[PDB]
């Protein structure tokens, strides 16, 4: 209906992080008609603009409210896996931490034309940094905004840093500078613009909505990619979607000649939609009577996510009032006047904080790269599940209760060895995917050992003089949890997502049989079909995954507009 009689040069499935970048770059020269189909609504929520309101986005209407299959290995629990559902996607609902990982993470992909030396200029191009000028590792005029956090907990941030120094960890002045080792303690930069969320809707899509060659539909749930097995090769024709949920008429947006469909539905929904389109393991598609168009083993495999557990400790009675929970709420759960004023006057104070923007990368045992990320929070978890405690914190407002003053250290396996999957539980394209995070399933128990040693590291830091000055015992995991076996069980019962999720449409070299796309991001076995989102990441980098997604989208846009090629190698004689 809004696409009737229209031909598009690019159809983007999803309007999330990658999609906002592509919509911007691909519509730039005015020659090409670009359609964006987002299932969620427009990006207008105040809860998206205010970083501390991440607490309100979990388990909300702007989230997919996805739960995993029962995990036998995690005390037989379903795991919540937060995913943004609106223009800007998960960039609109995330913790805003700005990480690229290490040069070694990209070289470890071993994909031609995607080495650390290939990707660096694409990170730098995207970047405007308020605290790092132009140099080998920072750009200055890109659409992203990155800055040092504009909240500082004067006692607790300083005490964390001195405690990490007291246990002998080195500082890292810039976690995105590849001229030095990834490990160390310091401050995570944030995708914020003077303390307001700088999501990829705000930075890439919203500024160009005036473009007549760009059409963005919200409330538009893609149901499958339309693919024709005519001439003698599967050819994308366009995309089926409903603007009215499961009962809506199935509409078809149509490609112009030379048109491509680009999957931008993210590492959960892209492989889900490809399988509904006949692209996936033939046995899984047959299960639900989906005709096999491209028998591709890798689709929905290689799901990598960074699992988390935490410690938490209260402060002494005399340090009551010093935590971020005290900066945001008073003792009745009323939002502090000082926090509102600081946010509106100059974009500072507790409302600019996602809480978890100071920390460390640590090697638990002589690894080539750090296996542990620590996120320090100058406030106290009231649940061993940190995402649950954030939902609790949002619900706490106006309850007339006082949130106890304390700290948390979240431990993340940032370069995990476990993999999971995403597939189908039904033929209905509106049903939730069959989602398996696969936490703690690696053959050697490496991810569990990372988190157990993480808890020992957090206890060493909390015991050090600088922090123990403020603290008064331990709430989580608590004095009941001391042996290696007790810690493992605490981890199984409390492990939660740190919200990465990559690798379900793995990019790979020619000859790599686990790959779903080539190094041009083309889906194997289909013409005019690409994936440009977190799905394509072969091997997850350490740290949060948003900045690598924007880098991949920037480079794909350059490839599709003819501004760049990918690979590299001189022809053999
Ligand atoms: C709570 C949370 C915290 C995070 N913390 C951080 C952090 O601090 N820093 C960081 O860098 N990274 C963080 N991440 C990860 C980062 O946000 C993601 O890796 C990145 O945003 C993913 O980009 P994407 O384009 O691949 O997918 P998304 O941004 O998820 O975009 C996918 C889009 O597709 C849409 N979609 C799905 N199905 C359909 C359909 N059938 N039809 C139409 N549209 C559909 C979705 O609604 C969504 O808008 C976090 C993630 C979350 C969820
Ligand atoms: C954890 C609780 C998070 C609280 C966040 C909501 C705080 C509400 C403050 C009152 C609204 C402030 C004025 C509106 C600011 C609108 C967002 C913006 O335009 O940047
Ligand atoms: C925004 C400030 C809220 C304060 C809440 C109290 C402190 C709790 C720390 C929670 C445990 C670790 C952080 C969990 C981070 C969840 C966000 C994310 O993963 O994207």
């Amino acid at each position: 209906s809004p696409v009737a009689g229209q031909k598009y040069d690019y159809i983007l499935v999803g309007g999330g992080t990658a999609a906002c970048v592509l919509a911007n770059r691909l519509s730039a020269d005015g020659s090409k008609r670009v359609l964006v189909l987002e299932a969620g609504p427009d990006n207008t929520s105040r809860d998206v603009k205010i970083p501390a309101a991440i607490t309100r986005l979990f388990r909300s209407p702007l989230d997919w409210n996805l739960f995993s299959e029962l995990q036998e290995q995690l005390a037989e629990r379903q795991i919540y896996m937060a995913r943004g559902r609106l223009l800007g996607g998960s960039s609109a609902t995330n913790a805003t931490l700005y990480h690229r990982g290490a040069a070694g993470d990209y070289d470890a992909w071993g994909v031609e034309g995607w080495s650390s030396e290939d990707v660096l200029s694409w990170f730098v191009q995207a970047e405007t940094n308020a605290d790092f000028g132009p140099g080998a590792y920072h750009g200055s005029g890109g659409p992203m905004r990155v800055e040092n956090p504009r909240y500082t907990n004067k006692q607790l941030h300083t005490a964390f840093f001195k405690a990490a120094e007291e246990v002998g960890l080195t500082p890292n002045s810039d976690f995105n500078d590849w001229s030095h080792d990834h490990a160390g303690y310091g401050t995570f930069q944030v995708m914020q613009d003077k303390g307001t969320r700088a999501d990829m809707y705000r930075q890439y899509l919203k500024p160009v909505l005036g473009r007549r060659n760009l059409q963005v539909l919200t409330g538009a749930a893609v149901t499958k990619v339309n693919i024709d097995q005519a001439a003698g090769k599967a050819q994308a024709l366009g995309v089926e979607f409903s603007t009215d949920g499961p009962t809506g008429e199935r509409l078809s947006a149509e490609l112009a000649p030379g048109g491509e469909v680009i999957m931008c539905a993210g590492a959960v929904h892209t492989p889900f939609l490809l399988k509904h389109s006949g692209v996936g393991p033939s046995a899984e598609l047959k299960e639900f009577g989906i005709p096999v168009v491209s028998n591709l083993a890798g689709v929905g495999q290689n799901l990598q996510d960074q699992p988390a557990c935490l410690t938490a400790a209260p402060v002494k009675e005399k340090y009551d009032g010093i935590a971020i929970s005290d900066h945001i709420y008073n003792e009745k759960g009323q939002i502090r006047k000082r926090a509102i004023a600081s946010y509106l006057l100059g974009g500072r104070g507790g409302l600019t904080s996602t809480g978890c923007d100071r920390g460390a990368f640590v090697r638990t045992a002589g690894q080539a790269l750090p296996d542990l990320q620590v996120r320090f929070v100058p406030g106290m978890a009231l649940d061993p599940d940190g995402v649950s405690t954030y939902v609790r914190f949002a619900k706490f407002q106006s309850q007339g209760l006082k949130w106890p003053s304390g700290i948390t250290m979240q431990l993340i396996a940032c370069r995990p060895q476990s993999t999971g999957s995403v597939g189908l539980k039904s033929a209905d394209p509106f049903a939730p995917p069959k989602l398996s995070p696969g936490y703690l399933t690696d053959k050697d128990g490496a991810d569990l050992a990372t988190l157990r040693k993480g808890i020992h590291w957090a206890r060493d830091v909390a015991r050090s003089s600088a922090l123990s000055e403020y603290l008064d015992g331990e709430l989580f995991p608590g004095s009941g949890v001391v042996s290696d076996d007790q810690i493992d069980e605490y981890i199984r019962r409390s492990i939660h997502s740190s919200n990465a999720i990559t690798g379900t449409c793995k990019m790979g070299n020619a000859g790599d049989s686990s790959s779903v796309v080539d190094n041009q991001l083309r889906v194997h076995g289909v013409e005019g079909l690409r994936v440009v989102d977190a799905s394509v990441v072969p091997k997850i980098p350490g740290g949060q995954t948003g900045a690598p997604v924007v880098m991949i989208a920037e480079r794909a846009a350059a490839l599709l507009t003819g501004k760049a090629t990918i690979g590299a190698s001189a022809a053999a004689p």
Side-chain angles (χ1 to χ4, degrees), residues 97-102 105-106 175-176 182 188 306 361 370 372-373 375 412-416 498-500 502 540-548:
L97 310 191
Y98 178 74
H99 284 290
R100 307 176 188 162
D105 291 325
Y106 302 86
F175 292 106
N176 300 309
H182 199 221
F188 306 145
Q306 296 164 349
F361 294 93
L372 180 68
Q373 178 185 27
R375 304 198 294 189
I412 302 172
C414 47
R415 288 175 176 95
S498 64
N499 305 302
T502 67
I540 194 166
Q544 285 58 59
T545 53

Side-chain angles (χ1 to χ4, degrees), residues 16-18 38-39 64 86 89-90 94-97 222 499 533-534 544-546:
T17 307
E38 168 60 41
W64 280 93
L86 72 165
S90 302
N94 68 17
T96 78
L97 310 191
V222 166
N499 305 302
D533 61 30
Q544 285 58 59
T545 53

Side-chain angles (χ1 to χ4, degrees), residues 189-409:
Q189 292 199 283
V190 297
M191 292 175 282
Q192 297 189 17
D193 180 14
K194 306 304 206 145
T196 303
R197 172 187 300 276
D199 64 59
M200 302 306 110
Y201 166 80
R202 183 186 189 273
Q203 303 310 123
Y204 282 91
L205 185 55
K206 191 191 173 93
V208 301
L209 288 168
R211 283 180 187 169
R212 273 189 302 97
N213 55 324
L214 181 63
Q215 190 181 352
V216 181
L217 294 181
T218 58
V222 166
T223 55
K224 57 169 200 201
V225 189
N226 295 324
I227 304 172
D228 195 2
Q229 305 147 116
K233 172 79 147 185
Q235 173 70 67
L237 301 179
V239 177
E240 189 185 85
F241 64 103
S242 170
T243 61
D244 297 303
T247 52
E249 190 187 340
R250 291 306 172 77
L251 310 179
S252 277
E254 289 180 358
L255 290 178
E260 303 202 50
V261 168
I262 318 298
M263 299 304 285
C264 300
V268 168
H269 285 111
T270 290
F272 170 85
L273 288 175
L274 280 183
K275 290 176 187 188
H276 276 285
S277 303
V279 179
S282 81
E284 294 189 29
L285 309 201
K286 284 177 178 172
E287 180 171 14
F288 294 112
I290 298 149
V292 176
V293 170
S294 184
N295 180 15
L296 256 186
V299 181
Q301 301 293 112
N302 188 49
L303 192 153
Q304 295 190 287
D305 187 25
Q306 296 164 349
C309 64
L310 63 80
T311 74
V315 297
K316 301 189 176 138
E317 184 176 6
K318 67 198 209 191
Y319 289 124
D320 191 52
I322 72 164
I324 188 178
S325 57
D326 302 300
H327 298 145
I328 292 173
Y329 293 137
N330 82 340
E331 70 293 330
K332 298 334 208 114
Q334 185 179 69
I335 305 288
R336 291 270 198 190
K337 176 187 169 169
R338 175 160 295 119
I340 301 173
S342 288
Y343 178 84
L344 298 177
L345 172 84
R348 299 176 179 283
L351 298 186
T352 71
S353 191
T354 57
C356 58
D357 58 5
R358 272 67 165 195
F361 294 93
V362 177
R363 286 179 178 86
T364 59
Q367 300 93 336
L369 295 171
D371 58 314
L372 180 68
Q373 178 185 27
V374 180
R375 304 198 294 189
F376 174 89
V377 181
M380 195 175 72
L382 295 178
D383 307 83
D385 179 328
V387 172
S388 304
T389 222
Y390 268 43
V391 175
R392 186 191 292 272
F393 190 84
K395 283 170 179 175
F396 200 71
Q397 174 179 9
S398 304
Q399 292 320 97
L401 297 178
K402 197 264 201 260
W403 190 286
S405 296
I407 63 120
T408 309
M409 282 179 269

